[PDB]
Each structure stands twice: as structure tokens, then as C-alpha cells.
Amino acid sequence: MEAYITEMVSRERANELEVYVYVFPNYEGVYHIMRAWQRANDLPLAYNQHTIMAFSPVRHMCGYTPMETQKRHINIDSPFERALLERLIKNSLIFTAERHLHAKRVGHALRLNQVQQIRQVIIYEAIELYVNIIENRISIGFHLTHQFEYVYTLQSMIEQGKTIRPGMRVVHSNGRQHYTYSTRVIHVRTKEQRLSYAATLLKPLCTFETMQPQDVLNVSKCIKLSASKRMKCTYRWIQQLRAQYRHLTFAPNPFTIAQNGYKLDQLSTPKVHFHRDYATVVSGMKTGKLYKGGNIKISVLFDEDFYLKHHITKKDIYQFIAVLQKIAIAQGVNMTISTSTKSITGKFTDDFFHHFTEEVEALQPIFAQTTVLAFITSTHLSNKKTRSYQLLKQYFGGKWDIASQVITEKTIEAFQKILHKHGLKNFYPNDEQHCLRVIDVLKNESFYYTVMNILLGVYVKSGIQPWILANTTHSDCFIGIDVSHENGNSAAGMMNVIGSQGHLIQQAPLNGILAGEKIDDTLLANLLKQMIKAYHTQFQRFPKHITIHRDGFWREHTALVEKIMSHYEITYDIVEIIKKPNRRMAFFNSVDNTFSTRQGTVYQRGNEAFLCATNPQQKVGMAQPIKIHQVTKTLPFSHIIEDVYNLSFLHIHAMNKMRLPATIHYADLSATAYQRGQVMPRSGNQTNLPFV
DNA sequence: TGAGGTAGTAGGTTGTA
DNA sequence: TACTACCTC
DNA sequence: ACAACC
Ligand SMILES: [Mn+2]
Ligand SMILES: [Mn+2]
Ligand SMILES: [Mn+2]
Structure with a gap:
């Protein structure tokens, strides 16, 4: 069983590509020049600030005189040129798809073909393409999806009886970008600004909230596909696109992780401790006594x-x-x-x-x-x-x-x-x-399961720890950090996991309401100091290593962390955990020509990894990977991945298994509860999960 | 709101030699 | 980020 | 204005 990824890497190096560079005398730059050149020349182009790059010489220039024209290679040391080359490659791929595959650049993806007609609702197939440069190598990642649209215009409502409410939701699609608000006059409004149309281009918005019943039941079955169908549909269209492209060359089977540079690692489920060691959480819950x-x-x-x-x-x-x-x-x-x-x-x-x-x-x-x-x-x-x-x-x-x-x-x-x-x-x-x-x-x-989830919620709201991890981890402390956004306001969710086995799961006794999405130095210093003090209180000794789990990208000041930590002579690590990486993982079985997924699988390449943490059923969909990125260097990356995987089995608020680790899953809830004013700090040394 | 999964929809902010 | 729908235990 | 997470 080979391991497959939804990516490919080119044979040509980044600096082995010959391109043309035009330089002209504000980030809008030469966007109008790009538009004029590509409407007059029928060529793939791209710009960046004031520089335009193309794969072929431009003849019809519409009376525009650049300063310097060069035919050279890329400079790898310049991130500007790497970004411009990535944009050019993406534009070239979209150009080829549009010409040779009848694809429409609708929204953020490429609409390809309609697959179902669910009683006046059309489901299309769409694909998202991503191009990156990873150490002189050009990688292309992709992702298949769907789109919804009604086959009837507001003109059809104008005729054949029935009217339209003034506050009705209508979308007008020009082909590339869509706005959401007898040939009667219309008064649609995206904002306080007023707008009018001919009532023959606007169509109703197709969303799960506005769909009638006995249609959601059928449109949902067509978007929740098996692993085999999803991967095969992705790869077939990708091969069709590759059959026409000429600028880059790939291996005959470029979808394996071996051709992409990843390493395979298989993780095993931990053991949990109620009063003895248990293979699974549910068995211990059914026939065991709680930990505390x-x-x-x-x-x-x-x-x-x-x-x-x-x-x-x-x-x-x-x-x-x-x-x-x-x-x-x-x-x-x-x-x-x-x-x-x-x-x-x-x-x-x-x-x-x-x-x-x-x-x-x-x-x-x-x-x-x-x-x-x-x-x-x-x-x-x-x-x-x-x-x-x-x-x-x-x-x-x-x-x-x-x-x-x-x-x-x-x-x-x-x-x-x-x-x-x-x-x-x-x-x-x-x-x-x-x-x-x-x-x-x-x-x-x-x-x-219902009654036990109710009881577990009551327990964690009261201060009872149901179970811990049977085996120790590679780190002592854990911190989860998250920020929530609602109506121009922000709140921070911060959690404490004290002990290697998770002896005490708790939130930081700090006020999470903050003005502007900026976790200030005072708040971070207070969080670190209270974490250290709490661990010392719990164990009568200072911790050796502290891990920081961040939801999204780490934007805080990394020098303050080291300044605080070196004072107490405690090592640390910073990890970014990305949900929704827009990638997919599967195992191909050539005996049966089917794709499958195994929980606990790791793809690693450098300081970045992909992890599978769930086992959804066939009618629920396909497992979503997790992207793990290490910013520091203290610990081995495998130990960090193992800690992230093992910390997600501490879902002490419910029997059902969650995907993300405990730190981030609970920091999200804590931030959301602080946003809505449903929680206040409490000081103590017991388990406290008021949001559950 | 018993809980979790996954998969559609619309907007908002960061950062860019 | 936010919302909605379905299924699973 | 494009890109990536929200
Ligand atoms: Mn976040
Ligand atoms: Mn969150
Ligand atoms: Mn709850």
C-alpha cells in the first residue's frame, strides 16, 4: 500500500527557468499595465509591485515603455522574485486550464463541470491550485471541492406568480467575482450604498440556510464522498491538465510521498489511566472508576x-x-x-x-x-x-x-x-x-453516549478529572493560545496543562478581554509566570521543558519568551498547529484500486508535518489532516508530533474523540466564551472547564 | 443547547526587497 | 472568523 | 492588488 499526497514536485529547479523581466518607474503598481498587456497579447503574465514577469516575449505593448528589459533567471535569495515566479506559474496553469479544459475562474477556484441536478440546484466541481517554492524546488498542491447555484433568475420569480421580499439575499456573478446583497427595477444594497440592476442578472443565493427541506438531504449526499471517489476525481483531472502543460515536467506517478520528499511514520494509540491502564477511553468509562x-x-x-x-x-x-x-x-x-x-x-x-x-x-x-x-x-x-x-x-x-x-x-x-x-x-x-x-x-x-456526555460535562464543570494518560510525555508543561474575532472585538483563550500525563487540565486565571488583536508583552509574561508558578505549586519543583501550542501562525514576540524562560533556566518550544491545510492523505491499495486512511499517520519533511487524527465513516466524509510546524530547535520534531497526537486523547468533556489536541480545542472554546461574556476568572488548583 | 465528525456558504484582517 | 446542513456514538 | 490564514 503506497502512501499518496495531493501534491507534486517538478523536475526543473527554480533557477533553471528562463523568464523575461520588465521594470517600470502603493501595492497596486502596474496592475493596469498587466491587464492591458494580457488583453492585447494573449499570454500568461504576472506582476509584483512594479515588475512584470512572463515566459514569452511581449510584442504588443500598447504604447508602454519600461525602464529595463532583461531575459535572465530567478535569484533564489530574493523572496520578491520567488513570489513573482510563483504567481506566474499559477497564472500559466490557470491559463492552460481555461483554454484546454473549458474551466471558468469563478470565485477563488476553477469551476469545471456540473455533476448533479438536484431539483433546480446545480452542484459543480471546483479545484484550488497552490504553488510554492521550497529550497529551489517548485511544488504544486491542489484541492477539490464543490459549488452551488440555482437554475432560475429573479426574472423567473417576476413571472409565473409570487414576489420577492425586500430583504431577500441575491448574488450577481460577473464571472470572476460575485457580490451578495417585465424587467422591473431592483434596489439591492451590499452596504449603505445604493445599487440597481435589470433583475435579469441577479440570482438567489444558494446556502444551506436558504435551501428548502427535502433538498438539503440530497445535496448533502453529493458533497460527502468516499475517499476513493474524491482522490480519483482529483487525480484524473490533474493528469488531464498535466497532459497539456509544457513549462514544467513531472514524473509519471508524481503523487506518491517518495516523489515529494516526505517520510512515513505510524503512531499508536496511547493508554489511559482511570484506576488501572485501559486500552480505550470508552471501555474505561463503561467499566471503570474515575481518576479523581x-x-x-x-x-x-x-x-x-x-x-x-x-x-x-x-x-x-x-x-x-x-x-x-x-x-x-x-x-x-x-x-x-x-x-x-x-x-x-x-x-x-x-x-x-x-x-x-x-x-x-x-x-x-x-x-x-x-x-x-x-x-x-x-x-x-x-x-x-x-x-x-x-x-x-x-x-x-x-x-x-x-x-x-x-x-x-x-x-x-x-x-x-x-x-x-x-x-x-x-x-x-x-x-x-x-x-x-x-x-x-x-x-x-x-x-x-448521550447520558455519559451529560455526566462528563457535569464532572468537568464540578472539578472531577475522569482520566489521565497512562504513559509520560516528552514535555512537562503545555500552553494553548488562541484569539477570537467578533464584531470588531477580540478575546484570548489561554489554557494550562500541568504534568506530563495531564494531571491537571485548567485555564489561566487571567482576563481574556483585549483591545485589538495584539497579545501584549505584559499578558504573555503573566501567562508564562503563572504557568511556572502553578507547576511549582503542583509538583514542588520547577519544570524542565515547556511547550507552547499556537492556533494559527505565531505572531507574538519570540524574544520575550526566551528572556522570561532563560531567567528560570527552563527550556521551551513553540509549535504552530494549522487546521484546514487544504491537503489530503490516503493509502492506495492496488489489489482493489481503492483509497483508505489510517489514524495516526505522519508525513514529515523538514520542520513541517501532516498528521491524521480521525477515522470518520464512509457517509461522514474524509479525514482532515493537521499541519504541524516547529519554530524552535530544542526538541526532536518526532517527539513534538508524538506529544501533539497524544494530547488529543484527553477529551475529558465527552466520550467522542476530538481531532485537535486538548490545548487548542479548549483554548478556542475559552476565547469564544470570553467573547460572549459567559465566563469569569476563578483561582484554584482543580480541573476547571466551565465552557466544556 | 448530549457530544464529536466533515463539507458547503459569506466576510475580515495581515503582510508583501 | 462566523454560520448552516447532514451522520455517528 | 494577491496571498494566506482566519
Ligand atoms: Mn485561530
Ligand atoms: Mn478558534
Ligand atoms: Mn457543553
Whole structure:
């Protein structure tokens, strides 16, 4: 089974290419000159600032006189010339595709051909091409995708009855770029600026939000392809394009990693520690005790809409809570229902949810020092007049710092449907020999994952660590850093993982609200110092090595990190982790002519790597790789990749496996929760994951 | 909002000898 | 970044 | 204005 990558490398070196350079006397530069020359000459071109490069001499110059004309090679030491050559190569490839393959440069990709006609919806195939220069080598990477469009214009709505709403979403496509806003006049508006059209070019926007039902079910099946179909469709078109290109030459089979310079490494799943060593997380959860148990006080918030709008009684809620309790304690966690929620009977009605802002602040002393189990209906959580979820989370997190887990009516409806199927409606509150039977019949259903995710959320919101890593890692400390953007505001998500096995997963007790996307020196210094102090408190000794995991590209001051770290004589490393690298990985089996994917596979070339961390099903899609980049030199790169892979098995908030490591996956949530004002700092030395 | 996966859509900011 | 849809456990 | 992440 060969290992394939969605890239190729040329035989010609970067400096072995003969090009023409034109130099003319603001980054717009000579864009108009480019446009004039290419409309008059029918040639692939490119510019950069004030310099134009082409593969062939330009004859019709439209009365333009450059300063210097040269026919030379590229200078590798100049990034400017490398960028210009990459642009020229990309333009040449697009030119060849457009002429010889009937491809349209629509949006950011190349529209190729329509594959499905799903009841007045067209799905096209599109491809994205990327050209890079990696140490005198020219690499071309590509990525297949899809596009949506309706076959009917607003003129069709003008005729054949029915009208158009004033706030309707319409897109006008000129071929290269599209704007989103009887031959009647139209008044579309992309912004405060007003615009008008002929109502015969504008078409409705095709998005999953605006699609009618019984169409999303079919358009989704055509974009979620198997690995084999996706890779074969990519490679067939790439070979067809290569059959026409002449500027570069490639091997007959350039899609293997051997022809690209990558190395193959296979990683193995770790072991987790509940009370002994377990092969998998789910087995330990099913038949094991937690790593660090304790006591939880739980309070119940119940709304009357479960009874007025549905056939759900408070006794059903308390029997569900009793079942949840019986599932616990068997794992070593003791939960007790607080009795303080007894003088507010019937307080949560529709008027309460309509006047939440004014009726709140009388509920602090009854829900204090507990974890709230919220049983609000979906409509009240989602309705724009009420917005129960936003207000609940905002108040309870950013005002009183009380954890809360929300359960809607669909979960209880499914639980009662399971009970109906098994025909078991005995009293599950204060009556044993029935909760045990309910638990036994639950283990054979898929609702076990739901109830266990609910319990794990409650646990990590209360301060219980369910499991750790059985084996040690190559680094002591870990830090995850992320920044979120909403409405011109920014917030930073920062996490602490203390210990080699992840003995303590926690967030930094720092204020994440920042002005302008700039993590200042004071914040970074405070984060590093608090990480060191927390590790020293936990282990009575200073750490040896600290790893920094960054989401996206590292833009912070790298000199401050070394200045802080050399003071304490502690080594460090900085790693950039890129989700969505726009590449794909697969194994080709020539016996069956099929592509497959194996979790834990590493492609490494230099200080950059690709990692496979998921095993999605055939109808879910294809695994997305992760790009890992090392900025420092302290540790071997293989150890860093191993740490990144092993740290993603610490998804202590859910049974289902996540793709990214714990640091970044939780820093993202922390930043998002700080953006919406749903969390406030808390000082302590226990597990704290209020966002979950 | 039980949780996670993957795959479409539209905008926003960084940095560029 | 943000949103939406589906499937899986 | 192109490019890469958001
Ligand atoms: Mn980010
Ligand atoms: Mn994020
Ligand atoms: Mn949650």
C-alpha cells in the first residue's frame, strides 16, 4: 500500500527557468499595465509591485515603455522574485486550464463541470491550485471541492406568480467575482450604498440556510464522498491538465510521498489511566472508576413548558436525575440534590423567560455553591425575544461564576421513548431494583453516549478529572493560545496543562478581554509566570521543558519568551498547529484500486508535518489532516508530533474523540466564551472547564 | 443547547526587497 | 472568523 | 492588488 499526497514536485529547479523581466518607474503598481498587456497579447503574465514577469516575449505593448528589459533567471535569495515566479506559474496553469479544459475562474477556484441536478440546484466541481517554492524546488498542491447555484433568475420569480421580499439575499456573478446583497427595477444594497440592476442578472443565493427541506438531504449526499471517489476525481483531472502543460515536467506517478520528499511514520494509540491502564477511553468509562472522584451538589432548574407545551412532569425529571445518580457512585462520584430549590416552586413560567433580565438576581442565594441543571425548552433558548441560553450563560458565568448544564426537551423525549419501547414506567425515584433495570436496558442503546456526555460535562464543570494518560510525555508543561474575532472585538483563550500525563487540565486565571488583536508583552509574561508558578505549586519543583501550542501562525514576540524562560533556566518550544491545510492523505491499495486512511499517520519533511487524527465513516466524509510546524530547535520534531497526537486523547468533556489536541480545542472554546461574556476568572488548583 | 465528525456558504484582517 | 446542513456514538 | 490564514 503506497502512501499518496495531493501534491507534486517538478523536475526543473527554480533557477533553471528562463523568464523575461520588465521594470517600470502603493501595492497596486502596474496592475493596469498587466491587464492591458494580457488583453492585447494573449499570454500568461504576472506582476509584483512594479515588475512584470512572463515566459514569452511581449510584442504588443500598447504604447508602454519600461525602464529595463532583461531575459535572465530567478535569484533564489530574493523572496520578491520567488513570489513573482510563483504567481506566474499559477497564472500559466490557470491559463492552460481555461483554454484546454473549458474551466471558468469563478470565485477563488476553477469551476469545471456540473455533476448533479438536484431539483433546480446545480452542484459543480471546483479545484484550488497552490504553488510554492521550497529550497529551489517548485511544488504544486491542489484541492477539490464543490459549488452551488440555482437554475432560475429573479426574472423567473417576476413571472409565473409570487414576489420577492425586500430583504431577500441575491448574488450577481460577473464571472470572476460575485457580490451578495417585465424587467422591473431592483434596489439591492451590499452596504449603505445604493445599487440597481435589470433583475435579469441577479440570482438567489444558494446556502444551506436558504435551501428548502427535502433538498438539503440530497445535496448533502453529493458533497460527502468516499475517499476513493474524491482522490480519483482529483487525480484524473490533474493528469488531464498535466497532459497539456509544457513549462514544467513531472514524473509519471508524481503523487506518491517518495516523489515529494516526505517520510512515513505510524503512531499508536496511547493508554489511559482511570484506576488501572485501559486500552480505550470508552471501555474505561463503561467499566471503570474515575481518576479523581469527589462530591457534587446539584440544583434543578425546571420550567413549566415541559408540562404545558409537552407531556413531561417534574417527577419524570427527578427520576431521570435519579438514573443519572445511579450511573454515578458506581464510578466513584457522589451527587446530592440541593434542597434549597424548594421555595421557588412554579417560578419558571413564560413570563419569567420574557422578563428574565428583571426577574433575575433573586436566584443567586439558592443556586450558590452548586452546579445548575437547566431544563429549558428549545424554543425559549432559541427565540430572539427570549434568548434563554445567552442570558442564562451570561448571568451565571460572568456575574456569579456558577456552572450550569443545559438539557432540552428532545433529550427527555428520547429517554421516555426508550422507556415506552421497553415498557418500563415504574417509580424510578426513591425506589431501587428499577433504576438498575433501566441502566441495564440503557447499556444496549445509543442513548448511553448521550447520558455519559451529560455526566462528563457535569464532572468537568464540578472539578472531577475522569482520566489521565497512562504513559509520560516528552514535555512537562503545555500552553494553548488562541484569539477570537467578533464584531470588531477580540478575546484570548489561554489554557494550562500541568504534568506530563495531564494531571491537571485548567485555564489561566487571567482576563481574556483585549483591545485589538495584539497579545501584549505584559499578558504573555503573566501567562508564562503563572504557568511556572502553578507547576511549582503542583509538583514542588520547577519544570524542565515547556511547550507552547499556537492556533494559527505565531505572531507574538519570540524574544520575550526566551528572556522570561532563560531567567528560570527552563527550556521551551513553540509549535504552530494549522487546521484546514487544504491537503489530503490516503493509502492506495492496488489489489482493489481503492483509497483508505489510517489514524495516526505522519508525513514529515523538514520542520513541517501532516498528521491524521480521525477515522470518520464512509457517509461522514474524509479525514482532515493537521499541519504541524516547529519554530524552535530544542526538541526532536518526532517527539513534538508524538506529544501533539497524544494530547488529543484527553477529551475529558465527552466520550467522542476530538481531532485537535486538548490545548487548542479548549483554548478556542475559552476565547469564544470570553467573547460572549459567559465566563469569569476563578483561582484554584482543580480541573476547571466551565465552557466544556 | 448530549457530544464529536466533515463539507458547503459569506466576510475580515495581515503582510508583501 | 462566523454560520448552516447532514451522520455517528 | 494577491496571498494566506482566519
Ligand atoms: Mn485561530
Ligand atoms: Mn478558534
Ligand atoms: Mn457543553
